[PDB]
């Protein structure tokens, strides 16, 4: 998965191991330094694009509540009209009563 402890500890380990690679040869130490800088830059780019995806998700979270609530009010009017239908049924009963009378 993802763990910051392991990556920071491994970064410290590789920074220490730069000493051993330099003892092996100085040019090897320089090459490891440069590739380490480049690959850290790449992983920084990857985390930044992950944060961009996070921003996308957070922005999409609240792009719809406006209309959603605005005519959840319309749904409220809908059950109001259902109550109106119940009133219609009541008045139909009242009128059919007079029909029978």
């Amino acid at each position: 998965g993802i763990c910051p402890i392991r990556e920071e500890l491994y970064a410290q380990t590789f920074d220490e191991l730069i000493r051993q690679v330099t003892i092996n040869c100085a040019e090897r130490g320089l090459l490891l330094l440069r590739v380490r800088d480049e690959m850290r830059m790449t992983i920084a780019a990857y985390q930044t694009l992950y944060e961009s995806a996070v921003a996308f998700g957070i922005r999409k979270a609240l792009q719809t509540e406006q209309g959603k609530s605005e005519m959840e009010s319309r749904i409220t009017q809908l059950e109001g009209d259902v109550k109106d239908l119940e009133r219609q049924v009541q008045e139909w009963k009242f009128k059919c009563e007079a029909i029978e009378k």
Partner: peptide
């Protein structure tokens, strides 16, 4: 308010 969030890195919550 809506006039503050200008850009495409906006945090809506």
């Amino acid at each position: 308010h809506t006039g503050v969030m200008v850009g495409m890195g906006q945090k809506d919550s």
